[PDB]
Amino acid sequence: NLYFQSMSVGFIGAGQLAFALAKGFTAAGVLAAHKIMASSPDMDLATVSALRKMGVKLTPHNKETVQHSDVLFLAVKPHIIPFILDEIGADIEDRHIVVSCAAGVTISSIEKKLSAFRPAPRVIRCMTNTPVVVREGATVYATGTHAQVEDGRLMEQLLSSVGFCTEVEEDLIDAVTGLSGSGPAYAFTALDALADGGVKMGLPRRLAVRLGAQALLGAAKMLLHSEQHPGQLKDNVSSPGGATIHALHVLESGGFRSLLINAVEASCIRTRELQSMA
Amino acid sequence: NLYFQSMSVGFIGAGQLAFALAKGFTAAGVLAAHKIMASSPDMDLATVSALRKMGVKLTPHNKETVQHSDVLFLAVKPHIIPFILDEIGADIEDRHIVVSCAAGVTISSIEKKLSAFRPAPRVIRCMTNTPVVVREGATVYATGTHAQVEDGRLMEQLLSSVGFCTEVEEDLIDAVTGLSGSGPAYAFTALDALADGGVKMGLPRRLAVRLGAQALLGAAKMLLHSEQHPGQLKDNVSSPGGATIHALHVLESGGFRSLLINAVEASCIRTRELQSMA
Amino acid sequence: FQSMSVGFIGAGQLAFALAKGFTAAGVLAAHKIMASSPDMDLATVSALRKMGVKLTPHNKETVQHSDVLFLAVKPHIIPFILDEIGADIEDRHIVVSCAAGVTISSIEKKLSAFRPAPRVIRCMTNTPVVVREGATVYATGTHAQVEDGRLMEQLLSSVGFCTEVEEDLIDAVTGLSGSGPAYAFTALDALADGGVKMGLPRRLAVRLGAQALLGAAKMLLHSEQHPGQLKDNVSSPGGATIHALHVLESGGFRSLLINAVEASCIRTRELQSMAD
Amino acid sequence: FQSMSVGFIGAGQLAFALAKGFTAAGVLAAHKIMASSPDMDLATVSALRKMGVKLTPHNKETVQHSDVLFLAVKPHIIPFILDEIGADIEDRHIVVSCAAGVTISSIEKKLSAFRPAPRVIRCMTNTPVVVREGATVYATGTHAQVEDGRLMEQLLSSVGFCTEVEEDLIDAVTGLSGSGPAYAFTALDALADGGVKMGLPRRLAVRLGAQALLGAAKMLLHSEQHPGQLKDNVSSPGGATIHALHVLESGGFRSLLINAVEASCIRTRELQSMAD
Amino acid sequence: NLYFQSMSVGFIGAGQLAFALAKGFTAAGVLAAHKIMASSPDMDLATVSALRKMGVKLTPHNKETVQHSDVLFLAVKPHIIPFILDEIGADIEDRHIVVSCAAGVTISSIEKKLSAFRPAPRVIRCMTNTPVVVREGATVYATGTHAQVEDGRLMEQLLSSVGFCTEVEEDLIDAVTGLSGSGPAYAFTALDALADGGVKMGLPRRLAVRLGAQALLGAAKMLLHSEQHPGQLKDNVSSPGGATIHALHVLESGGFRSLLINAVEASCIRTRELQSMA
Ligand SMILES: NC(=O)C1=CN([C@@H]2O[C@H](COP(=O)(O)OP(=O)(O)OC[C@H]3O[C@@H](n4cnc5c(N)ncnc54)[C@H](O)[C@@H]3O)[C@@H](O)[C@H]2O)C=CC1
Ligand SMILES: NC(=O)C1=CN([C@@H]2O[C@H](COP(=O)(O)OP(=O)(O)OC[C@H]3O[C@@H](n4cnc5c(N)ncnc54)[C@H](O)[C@@H]3O)[C@@H](O)[C@H]2O)C=CC1
Ligand SMILES: NC(=O)C1=CN([C@@H]2O[C@H](COP(=O)(O)OP(=O)(O)OC[C@H]3O[C@@H](n4cnc5c(N)ncnc54)[C@H](O)[C@@H]3O)[C@@H](O)[C@H]2O)C=CC1
Ligand SMILES: NC(=O)C1=CN([C@@H]2O[C@H](COP(=O)(O)OP(=O)(O)OC[C@H]3O[C@@H](n4cnc5c(N)ncnc54)[C@H](O)[C@@H]3O)[C@@H](O)[C@H]2O)C=CC1
Ligand SMILES: NC(=O)C1=CN([C@@H]2O[C@H](COP(=O)(O)OP(=O)(O)OC[C@H]3O[C@@H](n4cnc5c(N)ncnc54)[C@H](O)[C@@H]3O)[C@@H](O)[C@H]2O)C=CC1
Ligand SMILES: O=CN1CCC[C@H]1C(=O)O
Ligand SMILES: O=CN1CCC[C@H]1C(=O)O
Ligand SMILES: O=CN1CCC[C@H]1C(=O)O
Ligand SMILES: O=CN1CCC[C@H]1C(=O)O
Ligand SMILES: O=CN1CCC[C@H]1C(=O)O
């Protein structure tokens, strides 16, 4: 149904997130690549070359992206967002849905800037992650003061085409950022280290990478399809006296769990500072 | 459209692994549940009740499993394998392919036991993991002395229906056990801790669990479908000065990578003891 | 079990704890229990006297009175005891060894030199049998009749949890529930110190910490849910509990308790490796 | 207390735990209890329905039914609740706040704007009231009659330990027995992992570890002796237990539990510092 | 042959410290127990029952203690001192010497309270410790603005009967609190741990406790009676290659010395907060 809606989508910013979302949306068949336009003052990026190869329209002029779009994603660094809103705020129209993907930036700050121009800007804040590029993203969104009920449902339909999507209260989004926004990086670090461990124990690197990634994918999928606690799933792998429980002990002795808690906390706290500095 | 109409499968042992594989095989459609039989001296097990509901035939007698089966999975704890082989060795026939899933137990030790009863037993050793239950397992196998080329091909066909499967030299299997065999437990531990971090920062536990698992699944899928190094994918998530690179620093400060190397090593080393004692 | 006579070789902490639990339970009157020790001026001996237990310095007298005979001496003393009373075992006897680490095989070997078919059971229990909340496992020997294991389970269930195990599990049980009360007492003392640091009187802090641990343990015993699921019910988002759990994780709290069970289990095996 | 009607604002974990403990105790029939929550499709709501508790989406209905009204919503929601139902308090009412950190002063301030003399009690309890082994403290407000504190203690004693405290102790109690069950569940999971590492089946390891902690806590509650003296009774010289205690000490085990009580207490105060 | 026949002593507070001092004074023979009175709002205290058995007069009313007493010890918790001074300030007479034992509470704050009722209150501040109960305390005192020279001499005479006593400038007392006031607790902790070490190595607990305590008592006495540096005495016990120097190395490896410095510092710093808040 979204395809026949023939939506025009725009991205202010043409970097990693714009590429990941554009690739996921077109892979999902919801959007035609040429119905997406992205803007950036820097075309010498690999992301821009990849978007061009996809068939996405590219332009240096953010105003052109605004005029083209029905749904406008803000995909620039947090400190760039106020600059962006000053530049194209006069060009936001009643028809637009403005979707901010920027870490930390509040709906209130966005509506404050845009309401100086037209009085009821339709704003949605979201946080997502790069696995939308394989349509396995983890996305949350919050609706602003003037977003219609149909605006939230449209956003959920669009973002559900590239992974999990659910509405939340805005005060949860900084924490989501620390968990699933930054989460793929924690997983890539873990997969690299698990592969090093495989290689230390005699496996070829290529096989160690493949096996570790498949292990993590399958374990995550079991948890998503199970009602059981992750400790109960872990118990089903931990035979008495066996290999797994010996490995779990050395993780515990290093405070493995605490490091992952530290990471979510550190990303969430930094996300809050990215807003305060803007 | 795969289906083994002439294959009768039996499990010696009716525990977690027998349930995971039988559930995966029946979900994949490659085997009808009534062509599978499992034996265990304990029918008051939660996995026996679950196998019964699928339609798997069950018996207390290991000899009946052998007599019913062409492909015979040994799904008992490593120290039980020698008793099992003594019990049913005289019942092994030309048609049997014996597939040992036990951690650490060598092909040579199994062939030596079964050869006392009848020369040329057809033995395959495999290592898999519990995510075969959602058809996302990671499986390796090695062929024994008397396995025919068609036996390994058939086992790869069967095990590929529930996840990744590839042939390896037997001397890699203890290390695979430490990486992908124990791997799901490392992932469950990591997901439990990531959720704790989400809860600390204000997320409801249910949502934190869902988002953490979705982030790990998506990242693993990105790696499996990419030609790039986990570090390059990680670089795409680590914007300069951003939330993610701040979180990655606190992981590095605790030696996060070294803990996962420690874990693979400890599981691999213990697996070799679940045999050197044997 | 109404005409059953019970003896303890050794009149120390465990014999007191079991005899107190047994008599509180009603399953044994104190006058059916005898205990022996070479030192009648002991504190536990004085306590057993007050309860109505019969006391003798002579281990032979304990044996002649007893149907069920508990060995409650230190592990390195078991061989000496078996050499002293071996000629007095009488086929009516069930010999129940409580000593950490000492195998059924080593007991049957010493006793078989005197009479061929000694009925031996090995158990591991803990001091909370004194308030009838012990945790006990037992394994039956080569010549223990089926009714021997059943009588043992009837008796020990009166003072806490009791189940039969294979003998090769008992050293690990020792490291978990045998030593476990000491882990709990250490934890309770530290939790109380934490309460005192934040301004609670010591007596209130001890009471509250102990009541919290008892209640949580009961909750888990009465639940089918994973301990992590019960923990999630207490960890409200952003709240006080999840902040405390983080500082426990950061110190490797879980790993220390794993270390402890392991160290106790390994030492238990060592006590027997050096015995044999 | 036979014509006493009780309400809960909030129908979550604590309301379930208290209502289950109260009805198991016999002190309250389920039909004298009403609970309200904006989400009737909740798991705890479904459980309270099965027990016989009356449920409504409307907090005003809970207030009109109740004599004793428990506030069992998250701390940041208390001010909203008081603004919604303040005009409905009726002088027959005793308002019992269970929320972590929220002071009697802030509750009396919000309610006094509607009617001058609200009868307020603040308590801190824990989830083991669900098996009638909770640990509860309470402090009486400015307008709580003497009989108000006595009725409160009668009710909460039916589900565990209960004593009156000065309000300035309650944040510390929160860090000790309020959060304490989570420390115990974490410890029980780790002790079980230790049992499994040394070869025990998981189900046996969970049962034994939980039984050991329950029994030890009971022993201390029934003793006048210091927790170190009880620990000495388990630490035989050269034995398995003292080897395990050493590895706990070497990891700073005691300090981690002090850290935990402190961190929970401090966070509790912070939740109120940010409220006010 | 010391005895204060004209001195009536009172304690505001009837807890650990009042019991320790009254027991020490009566054991030293310098005061008859019936010339001592103590007040507390709680008679169900174990220290009240003990004071009663010695023959100390007891009352719930602090005003009666003041009216009976010449030397008045304030033996209540620091935050109770201002309430106490408000309650009985109007009852302070020319004859009274007010001796505050409360941690952290300054002479200036006590004189300011009592001066509102009657000018020139005679105030002494002391820090002592529980071993006065065995006449081996460590006590310091500072004299207030209106204390006469004979008041300090008399207090030194009295406090010397239960241990070491010396006059100090008031600004040393918070540090003395961290060293010898809290000191006995460090020693009890050390003795409990030394006994645990003896038990680990095979000693019965009773004997380990006796030997550890005797070793600490003897070593402290050697130092007090020697003109030599604790290091020189330590060198006499550390034979080359021997048992002791091996044990000293493992203490050094854990930073043993730094922990005790940390403790004195933490107690001193907290003591200053038990007043800066006041
Ligand atoms: N990379 C990720 O994993 C995710 C990123 N985000 C958020 O998405 C936003 C962008 O992140 P990345 O795309 O990773 O950054 P990136 O740095 O790859 O791309 C940034 C883009 O913005 C462009 N840009 C700079 N100034 C501009 C201007 N004045 N007008 C238009 N475009 C301008 C840059 O040229 C570049 O194309 C950030 O706010 C980040 O928090 C959120 C979810 C995940
Ligand atoms: N659980 C896992 O994650 C995986 C386990 N494995 C291997 O699978 C084997 C079994 O693992 P789980 O199924 O997890 O064990 P499990 O303990 O869940 O099931 C063990 C089964 O063996 C049965 N059994 C015991 N004695 C028997 C006998 N004499 N004859 C027949 N059945 C008997 C038990 O009753 C139970 O049904 C082990 O060797 C393990 O190394 C390999 C890969 C992953
Ligand atoms: N205390 C505990 O927490 C538990 C201890 N155990 C086992 O119980 C046994 C005893 O432990 P405790 O009772 O704690 O020791 P304990 O030292 O309190 O009592 C030992 C008793 O043995 C007596 N004894 C010494 N030589 C003797 C002899 N030749 N003949 C007779 N009695 C003699 C001593 O006089 C003393 O009364 C040990 O083997 C220990 O492993 C098992 C589980 C729990
Ligand atoms: N869970 C525990 O271990 C204990 C919790 N507490 C306190 O109990 C209070 C509740 O804790 P839990 O019950 O664990 O939270 P919970 O989240 O399980 O239940 C919270 C309930 O409040 C309801 N709620 C939300 N907004 C509401 C509104 N406007 N009107 C009425 N109900 C509303 C929710 O629907 C939910 O049913 C918190 O203040 C916590 O500090 C105190 C001691 C122990
Ligand atoms: N315990 C120690 O090791 C030493 C304590 N101190 C100081 O001694 C003072 C008391 O210490 P402890 O005796 O250990 O306290 P404690 O708590 O054992 O005794 C305190 C006494 O004060 C009483 N009290 C409370 N309110 C009162 C009031 N309004 N009027 C009269 N009495 C009242 C209590 O009932 C109790 O009898 C504290 O200021 C402490 O800093 C100084 C040196 C060492
Ligand atoms: O029991 C489960 N597993 C998973 C792989 C190895 C084996 C073990 O832990 O011994
Ligand atoms: O740039 C990528 N990401 C992922 C989530 C938040 C953002 C950051 O690190 O600031
Ligand atoms: O949510 C549960 N609890 C238990 C006591 C304090 C509160 C919290 O964690 O904030
Ligand atoms: O002495 C007491 N106990 C408890 C179980 C093992 C034994 C020991 O420490 O050796
Ligand atoms: O030389 C002194 N000492 C003291 C005790 C043992 C001996 C030593 O250190 O070897």
PDB file of C-alpha atoms in Angstrom, chain C residues 13 127-128 130-131 133-135 161 169 172-173 176-179 181-191 193-195 197-202 205-208 210-221 226-227 230-231 233-234 238-241 243-245 247-248 251 253-254 256-262 264-265 267-269, chain D residues 13 127-128 130-131 133-135 161 169 172-173 176-179 181-191 193-195 197-202 205 207-208 210-221 226-227 230-231 233-234 238-241 243-245 247-248 251 253-254 256-262 264-265 267-269:
ATOM      1  CA  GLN C  13      28.264 -28.571  65.982  1.00  0.00           C
ATOM      2  CA  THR C 127      23.857 -26.320  60.055  1.00  0.00           C
ATOM      3  CA  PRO C 128      20.355 -24.869  59.311  1.00  0.00           C
ATOM      4  CA  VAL C 130      19.024 -26.669  63.636  1.00  0.00           C
ATOM      5  CA  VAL C 131      15.983 -24.552  62.604  1.00  0.00           C
ATOM      6  CA  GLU C 133      15.578 -25.606  57.198  1.00  0.00           C
ATOM      7  CA  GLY C 134      18.563 -27.712  56.198  1.00  0.00           C
ATOM      8  CA  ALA C 135      19.564 -28.850  52.720  1.00  0.00           C
ATOM      9  CA  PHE C 161      15.084 -30.397  52.018  1.00  0.00           C
ATOM     10  CA  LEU C 169      27.657 -35.136  43.123  1.00  0.00           C
ATOM     11  CA  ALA C 172      29.906 -30.239  44.686  1.00  0.00           C
ATOM     12  CA  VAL C 173      26.886 -30.166  47.001  1.00  0.00           C
ATOM     13  CA  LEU C 176      27.250 -25.136  47.494  1.00  0.00           C
ATOM     14  CA  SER C 177      24.874 -25.921  50.357  1.00  0.00           C
ATOM     15  CA  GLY C 178      27.346 -27.461  52.832  1.00  0.00           C
ATOM     16  CA  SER C 179      29.498 -24.304  52.907  1.00  0.00           C
ATOM     17  CA  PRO C 181      25.474 -20.872  55.145  1.00  0.00           C
ATOM     18  CA  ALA C 182      28.902 -19.273  55.666  1.00  0.00           C
ATOM     19  CA  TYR C 183      28.527 -17.346  52.380  1.00  0.00           C
ATOM     20  CA  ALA C 184      25.141 -16.154  53.634  1.00  0.00           C
ATOM     21  CA  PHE C 185      26.457 -15.112  57.070  1.00  0.00           C
ATOM     22  CA  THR C 186      29.279 -13.160  55.368  1.00  0.00           C
ATOM     23  CA  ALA C 187      26.777 -11.469  53.055  1.00  0.00           C
ATOM     24  CA  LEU C 188      24.425 -10.636  55.958  1.00  0.00           C
ATOM     25  CA  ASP C 189      27.238  -9.054  57.969  1.00  0.00           C
ATOM     26  CA  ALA C 190      28.267  -6.908  54.968  1.00  0.00           C
ATOM     27  CA  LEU C 191      24.696  -5.893  54.116  1.00  0.00           C
ATOM     28  CA  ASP C 193      27.462  -2.777  57.542  1.00  0.00           C
ATOM     29  CA  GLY C 194      25.943  -1.123  54.484  1.00  0.00           C
ATOM     30  CA  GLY C 195      22.772  -0.335  56.394  1.00  0.00           C
ATOM     31  CA  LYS C 197      26.902   3.224  56.862  1.00  0.00           C
ATOM     32  CA  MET C 198      23.674   4.786  55.553  1.00  0.00           C
ATOM     33  CA  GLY C 199      22.427   5.472  59.088  1.00  0.00           C
ATOM     34  CA  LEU C 200      20.487   2.437  60.369  1.00  0.00           C
ATOM     35  CA  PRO C 201      21.035   1.029  63.879  1.00  0.00           C
ATOM     36  CA  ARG C 202      22.986  -2.212  63.705  1.00  0.00           C
ATOM     37  CA  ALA C 205      20.072  -3.495  59.808  1.00  0.00           C
ATOM     38  CA  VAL C 206      20.810  -7.133  60.752  1.00  0.00           C
ATOM     39  CA  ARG C 207      17.104  -7.940  61.099  1.00  0.00           C
ATOM     40  CA  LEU C 208      16.147  -6.293  57.786  1.00  0.00           C
ATOM     41  CA  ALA C 210      18.297 -11.307  57.121  1.00  0.00           C
ATOM     42  CA  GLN C 211      14.545 -10.968  56.577  1.00  0.00           C
ATOM     43  CA  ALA C 212      15.180  -9.784  52.999  1.00  0.00           C
ATOM     44  CA  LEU C 213      17.374 -12.782  52.215  1.00  0.00           C
ATOM     45  CA  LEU C 214      14.967 -15.266  53.812  1.00  0.00           C
ATOM     46  CA  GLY C 215      12.011 -13.813  51.933  1.00  0.00           C
ATOM     47  CA  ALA C 216      13.817 -13.800  48.587  1.00  0.00           C
ATOM     48  CA  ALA C 217      15.005 -17.382  49.008  1.00  0.00           C
ATOM     49  CA  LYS C 218      11.459 -18.469  49.895  1.00  0.00           C
ATOM     50  CA  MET C 219      10.114 -16.645  46.842  1.00  0.00           C
ATOM     51  CA  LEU C 220      12.501 -18.543  44.552  1.00  0.00           C
ATOM     52  CA  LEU C 221      11.743 -21.892  46.230  1.00  0.00           C
ATOM     53  CA  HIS C 226      14.112 -17.909  36.718  1.00  0.00           C
ATOM     54  CA  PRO C 227      15.963 -15.914  39.417  1.00  0.00           C
ATOM     55  CA  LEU C 230      12.257 -12.371  39.880  1.00  0.00           C
ATOM     56  CA  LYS C 231      15.122  -9.866  39.915  1.00  0.00           C
ATOM     57  CA  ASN C 233      10.362  -7.582  39.141  1.00  0.00           C
ATOM     58  CA  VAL C 234      12.444  -5.610  41.663  1.00  0.00           C
ATOM     59  CA  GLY C 238      16.061   4.107  36.404  1.00  0.00           C
ATOM     60  CA  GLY C 239      15.388   3.112  40.013  1.00  0.00           C
ATOM     61  CA  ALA C 240      17.398   2.443  43.142  1.00  0.00           C
ATOM     62  CA  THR C 241      17.685  -1.313  42.720  1.00  0.00           C
ATOM     63  CA  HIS C 243      21.736   1.258  40.330  1.00  0.00           C
ATOM     64  CA  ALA C 244      22.776  -1.117  43.140  1.00  0.00           C
ATOM     65  CA  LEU C 245      22.856  -4.122  40.802  1.00  0.00           C
ATOM     66  CA  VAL C 247      27.815  -1.730  41.335  1.00  0.00           C
ATOM     67  CA  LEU C 248      27.579  -5.457  42.220  1.00  0.00           C
ATOM     68  CA  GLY C 251      32.870  -5.778  41.192  1.00  0.00           C
ATOM     69  CA  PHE C 253      29.946 -10.232  42.436  1.00  0.00           C
ATOM     70  CA  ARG C 254      28.625 -13.246  40.521  1.00  0.00           C
ATOM     71  CA  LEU C 256      33.089 -14.393  43.455  1.00  0.00           C
ATOM     72  CA  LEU C 257      30.256 -16.750  44.425  1.00  0.00           C
ATOM     73  CA  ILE C 258      31.184 -19.129  41.560  1.00  0.00           C
ATOM     74  CA  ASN C 259      34.788 -18.952  42.812  1.00  0.00           C
ATOM     75  CA  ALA C 260      33.584 -19.851  46.308  1.00  0.00           C
ATOM     76  CA  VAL C 261      31.576 -22.972  45.335  1.00  0.00           C
ATOM     77  CA  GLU C 262      34.492 -24.103  43.179  1.00  0.00           C
ATOM     78  CA  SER C 264      35.009 -25.418  48.536  1.00  0.00           C
ATOM     79  CA  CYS C 265      34.306 -28.307  46.147  1.00  0.00           C
ATOM     80  CA  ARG C 267      39.151 -28.482  48.763  1.00  0.00           C
ATOM     81  CA  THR C 268      36.610 -31.184  49.683  1.00  0.00           C
ATOM     82  CA  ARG C 269      38.091 -33.439  46.983  1.00  0.00           C
TER      83      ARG C 269
ATOM     84  CA  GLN D  13       4.054  -5.851  41.085  1.00  0.00           C
ATOM     85  CA  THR D 127       8.235  -8.211  47.132  1.00  0.00           C
ATOM     86  CA  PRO D 128       8.564 -11.197  49.561  1.00  0.00           C
ATOM     87  CA  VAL D 130       3.961 -12.269  48.386  1.00  0.00           C
ATOM     88  CA  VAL D 131       5.064 -15.323  50.447  1.00  0.00           C
ATOM     89  CA  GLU D 133       8.048 -13.021  54.484  1.00  0.00           C
ATOM     90  CA  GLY D 134       8.357  -9.321  53.735  1.00  0.00           C
ATOM     91  CA  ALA D 135      10.387  -6.716  55.604  1.00  0.00           C
ATOM     92  CA  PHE D 161       8.460  -8.269  59.707  1.00  0.00           C
ATOM     93  CA  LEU D 169      15.681   6.046  58.094  1.00  0.00           C
ATOM     94  CA  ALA D 172      18.430   3.567  53.877  1.00  0.00           C
ATOM     95  CA  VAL D 173      15.890   0.804  54.514  1.00  0.00           C
ATOM     96  CA  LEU D 176      18.872  -2.607  52.245  1.00  0.00           C
ATOM     97  CA  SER D 177      15.608  -4.551  52.376  1.00  0.00           C
ATOM     98  CA  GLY D 178      13.680  -2.748  49.612  1.00  0.00           C
ATOM     99  CA  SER D 179      16.330  -3.581  46.988  1.00  0.00           C
ATOM    100  CA  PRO D 181      15.668  -9.281  47.238  1.00  0.00           C
ATOM    101  CA  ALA D 182      17.418  -8.374  43.967  1.00  0.00           C
ATOM    102  CA  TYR D 183      20.831  -8.832  45.641  1.00  0.00           C
ATOM    103  CA  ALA D 184      19.631 -12.242  46.821  1.00  0.00           C
ATOM    104  CA  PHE D 185      18.310 -13.286  43.388  1.00  0.00           C
ATOM    105  CA  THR D 186      21.650 -12.258  41.819  1.00  0.00           C
ATOM    106  CA  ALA D 187      23.549 -14.240  44.451  1.00  0.00           C
ATOM    107  CA  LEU D 188      21.297 -17.300  43.993  1.00  0.00           C
ATOM    108  CA  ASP D 189      21.797 -17.280  40.223  1.00  0.00           C
ATOM    109  CA  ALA D 190      25.597 -17.090  40.661  1.00  0.00           C
ATOM    110  CA  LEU D 191      25.702 -19.782  43.353  1.00  0.00           C
ATOM    111  CA  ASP D 193      26.173 -21.332  38.208  1.00  0.00           C
ATOM    112  CA  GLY D 194      28.886 -22.407  40.632  1.00  0.00           C
ATOM    113  CA  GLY D 195      27.039 -25.623  41.386  1.00  0.00           C
ATOM    114  CA  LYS D 197      30.302 -25.606  36.993  1.00  0.00           C
ATOM    115  CA  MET D 198      31.184 -28.302  39.548  1.00  0.00           C
ATOM    116  CA  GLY D 199      28.749 -30.770  37.968  1.00  0.00           C
ATOM    117  CA  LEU D 200      25.294 -30.345  39.551  1.00  0.00           C
ATOM    118  CA  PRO D 201      22.112 -30.212  37.439  1.00  0.00           C
ATOM    119  CA  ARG D 202      20.789 -26.667  37.280  1.00  0.00           C
ATOM    120  CA  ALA D 205      21.768 -26.320  42.204  1.00  0.00           C
ATOM    121  CA  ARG D 207      17.079 -25.580  44.978  1.00  0.00           C
ATOM    122  CA  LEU D 208      20.146 -26.205  47.171  1.00  0.00           C
ATOM    123  CA  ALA D 210      18.097 -21.142  47.783  1.00  0.00           C
ATOM    124  CA  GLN D 211      17.497 -23.587  50.637  1.00  0.00           C
ATOM    125  CA  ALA D 212      20.961 -22.788  52.038  1.00  0.00           C
ATOM    126  CA  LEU D 213      20.298 -19.050  52.010  1.00  0.00           C
ATOM    127  CA  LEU D 214      16.825 -19.410  53.534  1.00  0.00           C
ATOM    128  CA  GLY D 215      18.124 -21.665  56.293  1.00  0.00           C
ATOM    129  CA  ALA D 216      21.053 -19.387  57.126  1.00  0.00           C
ATOM    130  CA  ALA D 217      18.851 -16.296  57.242  1.00  0.00           C
ATOM    131  CA  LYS D 218      16.404 -18.108  59.538  1.00  0.00           C
ATOM    132  CA  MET D 219      19.277 -19.193  61.780  1.00  0.00           C
ATOM    133  CA  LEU D 220      20.431 -15.582  62.189  1.00  0.00           C
ATOM    134  CA  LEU D 221      16.877 -14.319  62.801  1.00  0.00           C
ATOM    135  CA  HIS D 226      26.838 -12.337  65.767  1.00  0.00           C
ATOM    136  CA  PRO D 227      26.812 -13.449  62.099  1.00  0.00           C
ATOM    137  CA  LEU D 230      27.566 -18.420  63.203  1.00  0.00           C
ATOM    138  CA  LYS D 231      30.055 -18.334  60.326  1.00  0.00           C
ATOM    139  CA  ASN D 233      30.535 -22.690  63.372  1.00  0.00           C
ATOM    140  CA  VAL D 234      30.692 -23.578  59.661  1.00  0.00           C
ATOM    141  CA  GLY D 238      41.733 -26.204  57.138  1.00  0.00           C
ATOM    142  CA  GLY D 239      38.356 -27.168  55.680  1.00  0.00           C
ATOM    143  CA  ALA D 240      36.379 -26.484  52.533  1.00  0.00           C
ATOM    144  CA  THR D 241      34.368 -23.561  53.870  1.00  0.00           C
ATOM    145  CA  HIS D 243      38.977 -21.942  51.662  1.00  0.00           C
ATOM    146  CA  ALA D 244      35.825 -20.589  49.974  1.00  0.00           C
ATOM    147  CA  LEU D 245      35.569 -17.669  52.404  1.00  0.00           C
ATOM    148  CA  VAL D 247      38.307 -16.337  47.786  1.00  0.00           C
ATOM    149  CA  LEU D 248      35.233 -14.212  48.659  1.00  0.00           C
ATOM    150  CA  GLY D 251      37.437 -10.265  45.706  1.00  0.00           C
ATOM    151  CA  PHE D 253      32.789  -9.474  48.483  1.00  0.00           C
ATOM    152  CA  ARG D 254      31.785  -7.585  51.632  1.00  0.00           C
ATOM    153  CA  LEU D 256      30.423  -4.937  47.051  1.00  0.00           C
ATOM    154  CA  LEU D 257      27.335  -5.445  49.225  1.00  0.00           C
ATOM    155  CA  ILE D 258      28.119  -2.237  51.181  1.00  0.00           C
ATOM    156  CA  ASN D 259      28.506  -0.483  47.810  1.00  0.00           C
ATOM    157  CA  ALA D 260      25.100  -1.815  46.762  1.00  0.00           C
ATOM    158  CA  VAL D 261      23.147  -0.609  49.838  1.00  0.00           C
ATOM    159  CA  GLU D 262      24.867   2.764  49.532  1.00  0.00           C
ATOM    160  CA  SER D 264      20.441   2.187  46.251  1.00  0.00           C
ATOM    161  CA  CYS D 265      20.045   4.545  49.223  1.00  0.00           C
ATOM    162  CA  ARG D 267      19.648   6.872  44.246  1.00  0.00           C
ATOM    163  CA  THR D 268      16.468   6.806  46.363  1.00  0.00           C
ATOM    164  CA  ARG D 269      17.393  10.225  47.786  1.00  0.00           C
TER     165      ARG D 269
END
